[PDB]
Design a protein around this ligand. Structure first.
Ligand SMILES: O=C(O)[C@H](O)[C@@H](O)[C@H](O)CO
Length: 310
């Protein structure tokens, strides 16, 4: 029971980012599983707007499928803000375990009340600081930097607490803000820095890996609910296949991006062991400060699940 259907899948990252390629993979699997009857059309590079607009399009029904970072979802469901706390996940194995386990599912289960289906989590990844003002290799080097952040109170409060002038902006405005130096820098995974070309306007890169961002792979509930069960199964089966593809592509992409940026002579710094402890000390009270704006039980449950996975 599958009828011909065209499905629009907009997203913010470049079409040749790992997640852009995973979106094309999803399209291919949907076509395969539906004998070519269900056709997914991908619109990358922010062609259908940034995350905030994509979310709204799924709620309204103008769009069917997207992936977005968890951070803009915090404007609908504050508990999703948990992932903007620094150093939550020691590595990607911990992340997968927590996200695919009960603590991840509790959050996904809050989406339908807002008109969204969280099909599963994809990997945005560990975020790294870039800027055009000066090298950042110490906590103090962040003071007064105008740093674009994602658009929720947790991200703004974290970087303000680290001394930055935190400037929330949609991802789709970011390259130009960097190029014109309306902001000094930003922070994102290496493959995004590469495929969105931020290195062309960001001479400095710090391998801070300070935050891990999940993507949520999303379907419009209004749209999903009017699918037949056979068609829903195509979507959920393709989503499971594509998650595995995505995560592998993301992790290979992270390795490839580091190699590329280094070989391109981007200037790369890190936080020494001492500076790392300074950052940990400064973060701990702002993390505690933000539990009330995320949800105490969410923060503590994610932290406990991460400990058990680590
Ligand atoms: O910096 C950001 O906003 C995120 O990292 C991106 O992936 C964003 O979701 C994209 O569309």
């Amino acid at each position: 029971d599958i009828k011909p259907r065209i499905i629009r899948f907009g997203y913010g990252l470049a079409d040749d980012s790992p997640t852009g390629k995973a979106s094309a993979h999803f399209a291919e699997v949907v076509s395969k599983l539906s004998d070519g009857k269900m056709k997914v059309k991908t619109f990358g590079n922010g062609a259908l707007g940034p995350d905030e607009q994509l979310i709204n399009s799924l709620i309204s029904g103008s769009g069917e499928i997207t992936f977005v970072s968890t951070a803009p979802i915090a404007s609908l469901i504050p508990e999703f803000g948990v992932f903007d706390l620094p150093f939550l996940f020691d590595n990607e194995k911990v992340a997968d375990t927590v996200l695919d386990g009960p603590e991840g599912k509790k959050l996904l289960d809050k989406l339908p009340a807002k008109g969204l289906i969280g099909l599963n989590y994809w990997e945005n990844g560990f975020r790294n600081i870039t800027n055009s003002r000066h090298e950042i290799s110490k906590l103090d080097d962040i003071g007064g930097i105008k740093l674009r952040v994602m658009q929720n109170q947790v991200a703004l409060s974290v970087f303000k607490g680290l001394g930055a002038n935190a400037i929330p902006m949609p991802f789709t405005e970011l390259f130009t803000a960097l190029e014109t130096k309306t902001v000094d820098g930003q922070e994102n995974p290496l493959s995004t820095i590469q495929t969105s070309k931020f290195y062309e306007v960001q001479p400095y890169l710090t391998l801070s890996n300070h935050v891990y961002t999940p993507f949520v792979f999303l379907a419009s509930k209004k749209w999903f609910d009017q699918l037949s069960q056979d068609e829903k199964d195509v979507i959920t089966q393709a989503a499971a296949d594509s998650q595995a593809f995505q995560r592998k592509a993301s992790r290979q992409g992270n390795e490839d991006a580091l190699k590329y940026l280094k070989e391109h002579n981007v200037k790369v710094a890190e936080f020494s062991t001492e500076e790392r402890e300074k950052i940990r000390e400064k973060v701990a009270p702002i993390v505690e400060s933000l539990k009330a704006k995320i949800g105490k039980e969410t923060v503590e449950g994610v932290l406990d699940a991460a400990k058990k996975a680590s």
